[PDB]
Amino acid sequence: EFVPPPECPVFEPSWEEFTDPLSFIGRIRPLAEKTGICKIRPPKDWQPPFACEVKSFRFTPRVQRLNELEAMREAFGFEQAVREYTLQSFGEMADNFKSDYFNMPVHMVPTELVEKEFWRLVSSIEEDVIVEYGADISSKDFGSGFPVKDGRRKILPEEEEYALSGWNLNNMPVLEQSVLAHINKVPWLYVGMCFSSFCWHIEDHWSYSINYLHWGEPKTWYGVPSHAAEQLEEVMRELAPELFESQPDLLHQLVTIMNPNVLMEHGVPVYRTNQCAGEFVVTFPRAYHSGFNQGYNFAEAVNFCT
């Protein structure tokens, strides 16, 4: 069965250390860059409100078949596809799926069991599980999960500090330095369900990324330090299908699903974490990462530069 990778570092900064995100990330970098990903728990009293317009939040999630690669059928390409949800109707669907699958209330399912079942389903040719992921939803559509002082929604006085916080993902620096920037991005939202996932990838321009789970069940992460990036790519090339082996990385990254134990068997260091509600995950430059959701949750993410 699946062997869980060792845990990535978790930081619990003081109020003093929590003042500037880039300053804090610079200081933890000697350790966190050696694990690729790390988790940051804000001070207990730091609780931003959820500012998305939930009334009109409607979306069509992407259909994901967990075992599509291992499955390499009559009328293929028409198995399942788009259907619009609200945040509420998606959550009802998500909870019903998980509780029916495990035959228990969703919050009683151990995280280690969903993890073991996810990787079993990914490689199983006998059971075909299909889930849905409301993801790559632009925050410019229904607003950010964080309050923003843009004059499009009410902000109570006690929420102003979160609209102005450096840990508000809308306030991260995103402009990359270049001479082209002298001659010449927004957060994305992720509505997960049980087993919805993201495959192994790095960010464009090898950027940092920062990720906040606003609410819901945990998001399980795997990360690989940047010094092992080429080792992971070599393992990918050896074990990937021949038809996908020669594809450009940006396209190959669409189907780069691989059990972490396989990477670990080849000597690639992999670290894991369960990002719970109210916690940040930071990925460092060229740190490959992948993961899946334990249940109905809501995440916000952006690439930033230092």
Closest distance to ligand H67 from the beta carbon of 200 (Å): 8
With b for 16 or more beta-carbon neighbours within 10 A and e for fewer, the 177-201 pattern comes to eeeeeeeeeebbbbbbbbbbbbbbb
Q: Where are the alpha helices (DSSP H) in 51-110?
A: 87-102
Question: Which residue number places its CB atom closest to ligand H67?
Answer: 135
- Helices first, then strands: H and E counts in the chain: 10, 14
Per-residue binding string, ligand H67, 211-240, x by CB under 6 A, is x-------x---------------------
Secondary structure element (H or E) that encloses residue 251, with its range = helix 249-252
Binding mask 53-92 for ligand H67 (x = CB under 6 A): ---------x------------------------------
The CA distance from 242 to 247, in Å, is 9
Asked if residue 133 belongs to a known ligand binding site, the reply is yes
Reference 197, options 98, 115, 96; nearest CA is 115
**Per-position DSSP letters for 117-181, written without gaps between them:** HHHHHHH-SS---EEEEEEEEEHHHH--SS---SSSS---GGGHHHHS-TTSGGGS--PPP-SHH
CB atoms within 10 A of CB 80: 11
Is residue 289 part of an annotated ligand binding site? yes
What does the chain come to in residues? Answer: 306
The one-letter amino acid at 75:
A
Nearer to ligand H67, 163 or 212 (CB): 212
3-state secondary structure (DSSP) of residue 16: coil
- Residue 129 tokens read as 């599980």
Closest to ligand H67 by CB, 143 vs 163, is 143
Among residues 120, 153, 201, 272, the one that binds ligand H67 under rule CB under 6 A:
201
39 touches which of ligand H67, Mn ion, none (CB within 5 to 8 A by kind)?
none
Between 162 and 198, name the residue whose CB sits nearer to ligand H67.
Answer: 198
Residues 104-143 that bind ligand H67 (CB under 6 A): 133, 135-136
Q: Kindly report the number of other CB atoms within 10 A of residue 282's CB atom.
A: 23
119 binds, among ligand H67, Mn ion, none (CB under 5 to 8 A by kind): none
- 24, 167, 190, 284: which one binds ligand H67 (CB under 6 A): 190
Does the annotation place 219 within a ligand binding site? yes
Q: Is 149 known to sit in a ligand binding site? A: no
The residue among 34 and 201 lying less far from ligand H67, judged by its C-beta, is 201
- Binding segment for Mn ion (CB under 5 A), chosen from 154-162, 179-187, 205-213, 233-241, is 205-213
Which residues bind to Mn ion, rule: CB under 5 A?
209
Q: Which residues are annotated as a binding site?
A: 133, 201, 203, 209, 211, 219, 289
Which residues bind to ligand H67, rule: CB under 6 A?
62, 133, 135-136, 190, 198-199, 201, 211, 219, 289, 299, 301
